[PDB]
């Protein structure tokens, strides 16, 4: 049975930023959840809407996967419902999710002694986003008055700030790769399904 490429989703050498999270779909294979819950490297395996007990029995047509890097104090912010700098900005999750959330700690792989500066995030936006949007534009923020029109002076700040990753801080400041799995079914024949 053709097996879905769950390896390259999790065992990826490079991970994108939270504000530029990737989206990869998978179809027409056989899903293997038995390699997911039989491991212990992850720190959060919570599934909203679909219980993990019947994960190997309940099976749908399309599966969506995301991947981005955050730290330890906003892992609860990824969950649907609560607010924060990773919730009202960058990523955003709907309230009717039928998927799962993956989280593990990778400190040595995602950081070195000199301090990582390759990760960015949206500090501030005009407003919140839809349950599923991507924000790539780096336009300057609009204060109550916006006379900068191209400069970075007063009342006009850069929305992107570098992300501090140093190996000797606390648990909540360490990098935390997060993978979000999305499950939904349409009016189409099932493509990926559990082994029999």
């Amino acid at each position, epitope marked *: 049975t053709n097996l879905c490429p769950f390896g390259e989703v999790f065992n990826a050498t490079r991970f994108a930023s939270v504000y530029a999270w990737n989206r990869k779909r998978i179809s027409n294979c056989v899903a293997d959840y038995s390699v997911l*819950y*039989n491991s*212990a490297s992850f720190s959060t395996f919570k599934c909203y809407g679909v219980s993990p007990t019947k994960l190997n029995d309940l099976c749908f047509t399309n599966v969506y996967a995301d991947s981005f890097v955050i730290r330890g104090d906003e892992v*609860r912010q990824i969950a649907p419902g609560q607010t924060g700098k990773i919730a009202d900005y960058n990523y955003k999750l709907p309230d009717d999710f039928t998927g799962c959330v993956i989280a593990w700690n990778s400190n040595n792989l995602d950081s070195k002694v000199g301090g990582n500066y390759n990760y960015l995030y949206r500090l501030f936006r005009k407003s919140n986003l839809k349950p599923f949007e991507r924000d790539i534009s780096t336009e300057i923020y609009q204060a109550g008055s916006t006379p900068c029109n191209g400069v970075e002076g007063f009342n006009c700040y850069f929305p992107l700030q570098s992300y501090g990753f140093q190996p000797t801080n606390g648990v909540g400041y360490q990098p935390y790769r997060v993978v979000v799995l999305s499950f939904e079914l349409l009016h189409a024949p099932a493509t990926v399904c559990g082994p029999k």
Partner: antibody
Amino acid sequence: EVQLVESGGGLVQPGGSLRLSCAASGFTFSSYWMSWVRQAPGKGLEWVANIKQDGSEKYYVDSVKGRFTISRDNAKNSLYLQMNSLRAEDTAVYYCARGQLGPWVGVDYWGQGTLVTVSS
Amino acid sequence: NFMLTQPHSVSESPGKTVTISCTGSSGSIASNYVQWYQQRPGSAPTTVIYEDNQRPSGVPDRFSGSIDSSSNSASLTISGLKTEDEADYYCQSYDSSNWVFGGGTQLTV
């Protein structure tokens, strides 16, 4: 139905070597996680160790690690636990436990348990 | 240091409903699944409620639970409160390559 009987040693053994075996039957052994939980007399529950379904992974806590080893054998549908250098706080009853889905959801079937007493 | 705080002997009601709350200290308990185990001293325990809110087969529908993220605590509710419900329940939560356990609540009637 499930049968989880064990043959642990309740004999007094101050700082020696004793092995516990928790037999399993009624289900496929090499498909689910295994774990060990311990309760002191008159106190609450506590966790000791857990082991992957293939024996590749094993975890303990700070106090129990370094003196407790655990390895399962899926061919004979049984598991073994061996400890050395016992101390005073090890007077408790040891229960062998099985996992419903892995390390996340937790225990689903509970064993009978043998009482282990260490003194001088 | 994910210690779980649970009161002792907080259920002293012969009738009405029962409420038991167990909270966490180091981090949010809503990130991982938290369950309760019904234990009969002098006998083997059994699972009364698993996952967040999932009742196992054979467990009566009187037992129910809830998750509140405001106080970072998990609740357990018993409806019938018969004589069989005498037990001590321990809240168990998942940690990174570790397992924690609650103090327990001795239910007297």
